[PDB]
């Protein structure tokens, strides 16, 4: 039922992070192809067909 | 065998024809479909399709 000696105790110069460090990224390349609409760029020689 | 009695003779005041009067016209409709080469006038208007 008992044994009379237990502690619990500090032992420090112990931290675990600070500053939150991030580095995600995304990369979405689906809405890189959701771009259909465009327009392109003509030129017209006379006398030509 | 004979009747002695056969003539020919003048009847004057009777001519035919001169000058040749010429009426005549073509219609080839034919050569008229055979016109295939061509060309077409253009015009461009700027910033459109």
Redesign the interface.
């Known amino acids: 039922t008992y044994l009379d000696n237990l502690s619990i105790t500090e032992l420090n110069s112990t931290p675990e992070i600070l500053d939150e460090p991030e580095v995600k990224i995304p990369t979405d390349q689906e809405i890189m192809d959701a771009h259909k609409i465009y327009?392109?760029d003509?030129n017209?020689n006379?006398s030509?067909?």
């Open positions: 327009f392109a003509l017209f006379p030509t067909g």
